[PDB]
Design an enzyme around this catalytic site. Sequence first.
Site, PDB file in Angstrom:
ATOM      1  N   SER A 200     -13.055  -8.789 -26.011  1.00  0.00           N
ATOM      2  CA  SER A 200     -13.431  -8.632 -27.400  1.00  0.00           C
ATOM      3  C   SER A 200     -12.285  -8.071 -28.206  1.00  0.00           C
ATOM      4  O   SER A 200     -11.283  -7.620 -27.613  1.00  0.00           O
ATOM      5  CB  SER A 200     -14.596  -7.678 -27.505  1.00  0.00           C
ATOM      6  OG  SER A 200     -14.249  -6.386 -26.986  1.00  0.00           O
TER       7      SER A 200
ATOM      8  N   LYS B 174     -12.105  -4.887 -10.511  1.00  0.00           N
ATOM      9  CA  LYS B 174     -11.204  -3.671 -10.371  1.00  0.00           C
ATOM     10  C   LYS B 174     -10.810  -3.629  -8.847  1.00  0.00           C
ATOM     11  O   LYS B 174      -9.745  -3.256  -8.533  1.00  0.00           O
ATOM     12  CB  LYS B 174     -11.997  -2.395 -10.680  1.00  0.00           C
ATOM     13  CG  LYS B 174     -12.617  -2.302 -12.221  1.00  0.00           C
ATOM     14  CD  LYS B 174     -11.700  -2.570 -13.307  1.00  0.00           C
ATOM     15  CE  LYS B 174     -12.439  -2.333 -14.751  1.00  0.00           C
ATOM     16  NZ  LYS B 174     -13.827  -2.977 -14.966  1.00  0.00           N
TER      17      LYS B 174
ATOM     18  N   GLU C  34      -6.764  -1.377 -16.924  1.00  0.00           N
ATOM     19  CA  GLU C  34      -7.469  -2.458 -16.363  1.00  0.00           C
ATOM     20  C   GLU C  34      -6.939  -3.789 -16.954  1.00  0.00           C
ATOM     21  O   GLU C  34      -6.157  -3.851 -17.855  1.00  0.00           O
ATOM     22  CB  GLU C  34      -9.011  -2.343 -16.499  1.00  0.00           C
ATOM     23  CG  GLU C  34      -9.388  -2.617 -18.045  1.00  0.00           C
ATOM     24  CD  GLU C  34     -10.705  -3.210 -18.179  1.00  0.00           C
ATOM     25  OE1 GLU C  34     -11.166  -3.964 -17.258  1.00  0.00           O
ATOM     26  OE2 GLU C  34     -11.353  -2.979 -19.211  1.00  0.00           O
TER      27      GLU C  34
ATOM     28  N   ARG D 272      -8.288   0.967 -28.818  1.00  0.00           N
ATOM     29  CA  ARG D 272      -9.521   1.763 -28.702  1.00  0.00           C
ATOM     30  C   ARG D 272      -9.069   3.271 -28.519  1.00  0.00           C
ATOM     31  O   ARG D 272      -8.181   3.552 -27.684  1.00  0.00           O
ATOM     32  CB  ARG D 272     -10.268   1.336 -27.514  1.00  0.00           C
ATOM     33  CG  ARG D 272     -11.649   1.936 -27.253  1.00  0.00           C
ATOM     34  CD  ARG D 272     -12.590   0.942 -26.220  1.00  0.00           C
ATOM     35  NE  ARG D 272     -11.621   0.413 -25.332  1.00  0.00           N
ATOM     36  CZ  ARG D 272     -11.522  -0.759 -24.761  1.00  0.00           C
ATOM     37  NH1 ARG D 272     -12.462  -1.696 -24.791  1.00  0.00           N
ATOM     38  NH2 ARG D 272     -10.376  -0.908 -24.088  1.00  0.00           N
TER      39      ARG D 272
ATOM     40  N   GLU E  47     -17.685  -4.639 -15.960  1.00  0.00           N
ATOM     41  CA  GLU E  47     -16.873  -4.954 -17.113  1.00  0.00           C
ATOM     42  C   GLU E  47     -17.768  -4.568 -18.241  1.00  0.00           C
ATOM     43  O   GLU E  47     -18.873  -5.109 -18.480  1.00  0.00           O
ATOM     44  CB  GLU E  47     -16.500  -6.502 -17.223  1.00  0.00           C
ATOM     45  CG  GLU E  47     -15.571  -6.970 -16.122  1.00  0.00           C
ATOM     46  CD  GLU E  47     -14.166  -6.218 -16.281  1.00  0.00           C
ATOM     47  OE1 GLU E  47     -13.816  -5.909 -17.438  1.00  0.00           O
ATOM     48  OE2 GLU E  47     -13.370  -5.945 -15.338  1.00  0.00           O
ATOM     49  N   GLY E  48     -17.265  -3.698 -19.035  1.00  0.00           N
ATOM     50  CA  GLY E  48     -17.665  -3.907 -20.457  1.00  0.00           C
ATOM     51  C   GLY E  48     -18.392  -2.698 -20.911  1.00  0.00           C
ATOM     52  O   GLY E  48     -18.781  -2.560 -22.103  1.00  0.00           O
TER      53      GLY E  48
ATOM     54  N   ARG F  98      -6.661  -9.749 -21.682  1.00  0.00           N
ATOM     55  CA  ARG F  98      -6.283  -8.463 -22.392  1.00  0.00           C
ATOM     56  C   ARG F  98      -5.910  -7.476 -21.265  1.00  0.00           C
ATOM     57  O   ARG F  98      -6.693  -7.204 -20.400  1.00  0.00           O
ATOM     58  CB  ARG F  98      -7.378  -7.831 -23.274  1.00  0.00           C
ATOM     59  CG  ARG F  98      -6.646  -7.109 -24.459  1.00  0.00           C
ATOM     60  CD  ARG F  98      -7.553  -6.218 -25.394  1.00  0.00           C
ATOM     61  NE  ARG F  98      -8.466  -5.438 -24.595  1.00  0.00           N
ATOM     62  CZ  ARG F  98      -9.795  -5.530 -24.577  1.00  0.00           C
ATOM     63  NH1 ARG F  98     -10.535  -6.509 -25.203  1.00  0.00           N
ATOM     64  NH2 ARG F  98     -10.425  -4.725 -23.708  1.00  0.00           N
TER      65      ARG F  98
ATOM     66  N   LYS G 206     -14.611   3.508 -10.194  1.00  0.00           N
ATOM     67  CA  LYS G 206     -15.047   2.327 -10.966  1.00  0.00           C
ATOM     68  C   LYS G 206     -15.718   1.320 -10.061  1.00  0.00           C
ATOM     69  O   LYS G 206     -15.167   0.909  -9.016  1.00  0.00           O
ATOM     70  CB  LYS G 206     -13.870   1.630 -11.581  1.00  0.00           C
ATOM     71  CG  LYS G 206     -12.782   2.543 -12.023  1.00  0.00           C
ATOM     72  CD  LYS G 206     -12.361   2.169 -13.391  1.00  0.00           C
ATOM     73  CE  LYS G 206     -10.900   1.949 -13.509  1.00  0.00           C
ATOM     74  NZ  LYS G 206     -10.224   1.927 -14.767  1.00  0.00           N
TER      75      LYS G 206
ATOM     76  N   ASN H  68      -8.350  -7.518 -18.258  1.00  0.00           N
ATOM     77  CA  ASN H  68      -9.605  -8.087 -18.627  1.00  0.00           C
ATOM     78  C   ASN H  68      -9.392  -9.639 -18.652  1.00  0.00           C
ATOM     79  O   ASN H  68      -8.671 -10.084 -19.519  1.00  0.00           O
ATOM     80  CB  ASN H  68     -10.075  -7.650 -20.087  1.00  0.00           C
ATOM     81  CG  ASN H  68     -10.613  -6.239 -20.075  1.00  0.00           C
ATOM     82  OD1 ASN H  68     -11.717  -5.998 -19.544  1.00  0.00           O
ATOM     83  ND2 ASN H  68      -9.888  -5.360 -20.657  1.00  0.00           N
TER      84      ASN H  68
HETATM   85  N1  LIG Z   1      -7.185   5.604 -14.704  1.00  0.00           N
HETATM   86  C1  LIG Z   1      -7.797   6.042 -15.862  1.00  0.00           C
HETATM   87  N2  LIG Z   1      -7.372   7.179 -16.503  1.00  0.00           N
HETATM   88  C2  LIG Z   1      -7.987   7.620 -17.677  1.00  0.00           C
HETATM   89  N3  LIG Z   1      -9.150   7.021 -18.175  1.00  0.00           N
HETATM   90  C3  LIG Z   1      -9.622   5.823 -17.663  1.00  0.00           C
HETATM   91  C4  LIG Z   1      -8.944   5.245 -16.466  1.00  0.00           C
HETATM   92  N4  LIG Z   1      -9.714   4.192 -16.094  1.00  0.00           N
HETATM   93  C5  LIG Z   1     -10.739   4.058 -17.009  1.00  0.00           C
HETATM   94  N5  LIG Z   1     -10.694   5.019 -17.930  1.00  0.00           N
HETATM   95  C6  LIG Z   1     -11.586   5.235 -19.114  1.00  0.00           C
HETATM   96  O1  LIG Z   1     -12.798   4.505 -18.908  1.00  0.00           O
HETATM   97  C7  LIG Z   1     -12.880   3.377 -19.840  1.00  0.00           C
HETATM   98  C8  LIG Z   1     -13.613   2.239 -19.107  1.00  0.00           C
HETATM   99  O2  LIG Z   1     -12.731   1.812 -17.976  1.00  0.00           O
HETATM  100  P1  LIG Z   1     -12.199   0.365 -17.612  1.00  0.00           P
HETATM  101  O3  LIG Z   1     -11.366   0.457 -16.357  1.00  0.00           O
HETATM  102  O4  LIG Z   1     -11.415  -0.043 -18.783  1.00  0.00           O
HETATM  103  O5  LIG Z   1     -13.558  -0.355 -17.414  1.00  0.00           O
HETATM  104  P2  LIG Z   1     -14.349  -1.483 -18.293  1.00  0.00           P
HETATM  105  O6  LIG Z   1     -14.241  -2.861 -17.681  1.00  0.00           O
HETATM  106  O7  LIG Z   1     -15.734  -1.174 -18.174  1.00  0.00           O
HETATM  107  O8  LIG Z   1     -13.888  -1.416 -19.676  1.00  0.00           O
HETATM  108  C9  LIG Z   1     -11.435   3.238 -20.301  1.00  0.00           C
HETATM  109  O9  LIG Z   1     -11.343   2.608 -21.574  1.00  0.00           O
HETATM  110  C10 LIG Z   1     -10.839   4.696 -20.319  1.00  0.00           C
HETATM  111  O10 LIG Z   1     -11.260   5.277 -21.585  1.00  0.00           O
HETATM  112  N1  LIG Z   2     -20.607  -9.518 -25.599  1.00  0.00           N
HETATM  113  C1  LIG Z   2     -19.237  -9.086 -25.871  1.00  0.00           C
HETATM  114  C2  LIG Z   2     -18.903  -7.637 -25.511  1.00  0.00           C
HETATM  115  C3  LIG Z   2     -17.874  -7.899 -24.358  1.00  0.00           C
HETATM  116  C4  LIG Z   2     -16.944  -6.817 -23.995  1.00  0.00           C
HETATM  117  O1  LIG Z   2     -17.194  -5.558 -24.415  1.00  0.00           O
HETATM  118  N2  LIG Z   2     -16.021  -7.291 -23.284  1.00  0.00           N
HETATM  119  C5  LIG Z   2     -14.859  -6.549 -22.776  1.00  0.00           C
HETATM  120  C6  LIG Z   2     -14.315  -7.266 -21.413  1.00  0.00           C
HETATM  121  S1  LIG Z   2     -15.973  -7.746 -20.768  1.00  0.00           S
HETATM  122  C7  LIG Z   2     -13.789  -6.259 -23.912  1.00  0.00           C
HETATM  123  O2  LIG Z   2     -12.787  -7.011 -23.622  1.00  0.00           O
HETATM  124  N3  LIG Z   2     -13.678  -5.352 -25.021  1.00  0.00           N
HETATM  125  C8  LIG Z   2     -14.181  -4.190 -26.014  1.00  0.00           C
HETATM  126  C9  LIG Z   2     -15.609  -3.395 -26.026  1.00  0.00           C
HETATM  127  C10 LIG Z   2     -16.026  -1.928 -26.750  1.00  0.00           C
HETATM  128  O3  LIG Z   2     -15.003  -0.956 -26.677  1.00  0.00           O
HETATM  129  O4  LIG Z   2     -17.232  -2.018 -27.383  1.00  0.00           O
HETATM  130  C11 LIG Z   2     -18.341  -9.503 -27.048  1.00  0.00           C
HETATM  131  O5  LIG Z   2     -17.733 -10.497 -26.673  1.00  0.00           O
HETATM  132  O6  LIG Z   2     -18.087  -8.821 -28.121  1.00  0.00           O
HETATM  133 MG   LIG Z   3     -11.165  -6.381 -15.366  1.00  0.00          MG
HETATM  134 MG   LIG Z   4     -12.959  -4.433 -18.605  1.00  0.00          MG
HETATM  135 MG   LIG Z   5     -11.964  -1.262 -20.372  1.00  0.00          MG
END
Ligand SMILES: Nc1ncnc2c1ncn2[C@@H]1O[C@H](COP(=O)(O)OP(=O)(O)O)[C@@H](O)[C@H]1O
Ligand SMILES: N[C@H](CCC(=O)N[C@@H](CS)C(=O)NCCC(=O)O)C(=O)O
Ligand SMILES: [Mg+2]
Ligand SMILES: [Mg+2]
Ligand SMILES: [Mg+2]
Lengths: 468, 470
Positions: free
Chosen positions: B152, B310, B145, B446, B368-369, B129, B364, B147
């Site tokens: 999910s 990341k 990012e 999202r 993840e997640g 994703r 960051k 994934n």
């Molecule tokens: N460069 C960015 N600009 C704006 N918001 C961000 C950015 N990077 C992350 N975020 C916010 O933080 C959330 C979590 O970041 P992400 O890089 O997707 O990490 P994770 O693997 O934990 O999902 C994102 O869904 C977004 O809402």
């Molecule tokens: N245990 C797991 C939860 C796994 C999960 O959150 N994974 C990440 C990449 S790790 C994701 O891709 N997406 C959406 C999450 C939110 O916005 O709640 C499940 O498989 O449901």
């Molecule tokens: Mg990733």
């Molecule tokens: Mg992620």
């Molecule tokens: Mg994310």
Amino acid sequence: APPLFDYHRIDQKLLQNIVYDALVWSTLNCLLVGDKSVQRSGRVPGVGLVHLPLSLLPGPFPESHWKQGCELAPIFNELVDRVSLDGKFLQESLSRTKNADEFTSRLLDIHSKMLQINKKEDIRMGIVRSDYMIDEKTKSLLQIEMNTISTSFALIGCLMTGLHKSLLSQYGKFLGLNSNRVPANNAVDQSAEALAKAWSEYNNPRAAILVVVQVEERNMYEQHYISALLREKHHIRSIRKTLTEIDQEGKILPDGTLSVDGQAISVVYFRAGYTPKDYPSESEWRARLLMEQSSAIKCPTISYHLVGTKKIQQELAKPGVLERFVENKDHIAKLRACFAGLWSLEDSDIVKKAIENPELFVMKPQREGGGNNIYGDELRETLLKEDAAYILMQRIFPATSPAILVRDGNWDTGHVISEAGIFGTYLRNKDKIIINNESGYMVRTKISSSYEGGVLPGFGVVDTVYLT
Amino acid sequence: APPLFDYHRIDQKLLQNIVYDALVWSTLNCLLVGDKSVQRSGRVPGVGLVHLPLSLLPGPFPESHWKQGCELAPIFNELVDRVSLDGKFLQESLSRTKNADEFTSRLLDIHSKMLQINKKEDIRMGIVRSDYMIDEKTKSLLQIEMNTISTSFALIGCLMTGLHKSLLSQYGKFLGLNSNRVPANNAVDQSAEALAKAWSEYNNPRAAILVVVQVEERNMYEQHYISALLREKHHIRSIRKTLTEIDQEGKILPDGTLSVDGQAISVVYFRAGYTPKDYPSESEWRARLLMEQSSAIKCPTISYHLVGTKKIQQELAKPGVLERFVENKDHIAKLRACFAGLWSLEDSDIVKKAIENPELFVMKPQREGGGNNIYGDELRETLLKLQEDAAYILMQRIFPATSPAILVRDGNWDTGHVISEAGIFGTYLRNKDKIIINNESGYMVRTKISSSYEGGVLPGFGVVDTVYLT
Ligand SMILES: Nc1ncnc2c1ncn2[C@@H]1O[C@H](COP(=O)(O)OP(=O)(O)O)[C@@H](O)[C@H]1O
Ligand SMILES: N[C@H](CCC(=O)N[C@@H](CS)C(=O)NCCC(=O)O)C(=O)O
Ligand SMILES: [Mg+2]
Ligand SMILES: [Mg+2]
Ligand SMILES: [Mg+2]
Ligand SMILES: Nc1ncnc2c1ncn2[C@@H]1O[C@H](COP(=O)(O)OP(=O)(O)O)[C@@H](O)[C@H]1O
Ligand SMILES: N[C@H](CCC(=O)N[C@@H](CS)C(=O)NCCC(=O)O)C(=O)O
Ligand SMILES: N[C@H](CCC(=O)N[C@@H](CS)C(=O)NCCC(=O)O)C(=O)O
Ligand SMILES: N[C@H](CCC(=O)N[C@@H](CS)C(=O)NCCC(=O)O)C(=O)O
Ligand SMILES: [Mg+2]
Ligand SMILES: [Mg+2]
């Protein structure tokens, strides 16, 4: 004849797998209701959901008796429709009932009105359920009751059939069991299809179906599924209203058409108005009368509603009254065959027999939806001390079967009896009978010795049958 | 773009109807998770169910950018596979990370092990994703990012498509909105298809798919749905096991075949192991290594997992680094177009710039997640105390154009002004030099209050959505 695998003797880890798989299936396929412990779950969809109390695996039911039930479905459809046309029969049979039971008197007053206006009505339909137990002694399929109004569990019954078939597909090899011995079930689809065809007979494509519901309805999903069918498959609009809201938003247009909140209605489907609890005010009785006076097709009509009273089921069982209503002699035989002992509280021979042996009898008021019946001790005590409010019936005693009962995510062993509900759907137009069908099933299962078996009340579970 | 109906200006009565219809649809169609308030709901299926926190009606997203995302899916599928083959690049990029981050170091140790073994595996798969925000000043689709592990919302994204299509069919006429401008979505069906076809490539019909799950999983229904598809449509058995149960019941057969509780496994689909929380003991690490050493097709493998850190996303963005891994020049341009500013904390032009202007930046860690990152005040404080930084990257803060949302959460709705993040799934399957699947496979969205740092849907911060193409 070798009985079915005893469901209390499954390996504990095998059993934990079946249960987990059932819970998962239930959730994916919306075998769900509002949980009684979550305050808003009977108002606000989406919240405080829980799987239906269920029986993990089907009990045995012989194919011969299943066939008897199936066959009786178009027979009872016809009977109900023929008795509903005898307004004199209904008013007379219920004449003393009228004075003991103010709810039945109210029903009667709407019907008297319809009689005194005499409209040519010739479309008019049914979505009904004839419920049976097999009495062990006699080995006979016996009718418990006829349900002519707001019959439940067409979707629950068909989703139970899906559940048992999926559990037997996966686990059937370990048990001596084949999914194909759980009868195919089309009940929800058949239910929507009767509503669509009725709507089609009225024939106005801009009219909608009015669904009359209760103010709290934990089993709302099943009604939402039927409306989703009408919308998506049959392309027919539904609207859901309580009897209060119909009094508030309803009128009869100058051309006799029901309009509710500005929407013309051609079909009124009742998921309510079968209990006094639905009539807190004159507001609800006015709504009921208002809809009856419409050219909307009711499902059911006030006359059908009266047919389903336990007092009529009792009258019908009297010597030569079935024969006022049916002339096919093979049908009278089949009908007669599933009737259990039924008696008026004026047969005082049988009142003596009942005070003396209360364990052998059921006592039923003119109600629908469970709670209400009286057995053993409370029945002697009520009978000693308004008699027209009750009938008396032969207590039926099925053969018990081991069950796994799943209720709130937890399972226990019990020994149960089941009750098979065989849906009928019916539509005619003049002389022209368009639908007169056995339309699937539901079965309700309870601990063998429990008086009440209402599922949503906490007393019973849903099930299927395994044909023997 | 003609502006969409402002969803804060709908009549109260119309709006109550649309919410009610959305709650009813969510129930019928198992848009449902365990409710975080019911203790058992992440282990006992069937109990304490609640609809997904959702956005009632979609926000605008231009069709031009939606096309860009689509395009870029088989591009990223290919990239991620090409980078995963460079075991040196991964180990070298994460070499400082290794010392700063115990979780990443354990991931690296498994991959080091598979480098020595050097077994040649001709069959690789991904279910991934790529997540994007359109930054307003500059109208550009930028990747948040990548994934590569346990992605999910394939089922939640398609059910959200179904919901918005159903609410627009009924209500679109009142709103100037058409269901057709919510893109078609096949994401869960595509997910199950990639798993079935990988199982087919391995080609043992008595083998099963092992699904690796977390101990508490309120989003279990989506896993259940995929295993139901595998069973009913593709006729493939699944079994679900936590990592600890895999260490307790798993072994490699003499022929190299993973066997768990007596069942041969030819595919391992991870819905877990992407967080240190999944490894409370050496049991889970041993389970992870056990499965990687097996002949089973991993989705994903340890190298794919590393690619999705990341740190690598930041390394890939370094000048000429992409160019090692992609030959197609039109793809490099496409890829480089969605890259936002990305920097190692060893760049202290950017560490100074970030400390002066912390609201312009996201920090960051290698996680993840959810609910991991660092912004504004907490970012300047964490960055100033760092004078091991190898744990973080720094990224340009992206600021989409906000849209009015109705947010529906436990049966109640509120107004808010939101931003969305479009997650474009890709599915990938090759056998030697034959590419069997290399696809854009549906989506999820999202949405969160514009100013919220966190937007995790299950953690209670964000809602699922779709997009309305404009
Ligand atoms: N460069 C960015 N600009 C704006 N918001 C961000 C950015 N990077 C992350 N975020 C916010 O933080 C959330 C979590 O970041 P992400 O890089 O997707 O990490 P994770 O693997 O934990 O999902 C994102 O869904 C977004 O809402
Ligand atoms: N245990 C797991 C939860 C796994 C999960 O959150 N994974 C990440 C990449 S790790 C994701 O891709 N997406 C959406 C999450 C939110 O916005 O709640 C499940 O498989 O449901
Ligand atoms: Mg990733
Ligand atoms: Mg992620
Ligand atoms: Mg994310
Ligand atoms: N004749 C009978 N013998 C055995 N049990 C009965 C009989 N009549 C009713 N019951 C029990 O009472 C329940 C409620 O009775 P029923 O006649 O079906 O009334 P209701 O309209 O309220 O559902 C039945 O489902 C069954 O469990
Ligand atoms: N509020 C109404 C509920 C109506 C209801 O309970 N109805 C009776 C005839 S009235 C019934 O036919 N069946 C199944 C009951 C059981 O076994 O536990 C609805 O949802 O229909
Ligand atoms: N979509 C349904 C599914 C097929 C069916 O024969 N029966 C349905 C409806 S009653 C059922 O009740 N249970 C099985 C539920 C499922 O797995 O989808 C249909 O086409 O009728
Ligand atoms: N159709 C009703 C409503 C439920 C629904 O939308 N389901 C979604 C979730 S994927 C779905 O699969 N949509 C088409 C799949 C695709 O295009 O690949 C139902 O499912 O019974
Ligand atoms: Mg009953
Ligand atoms: Mg009844």
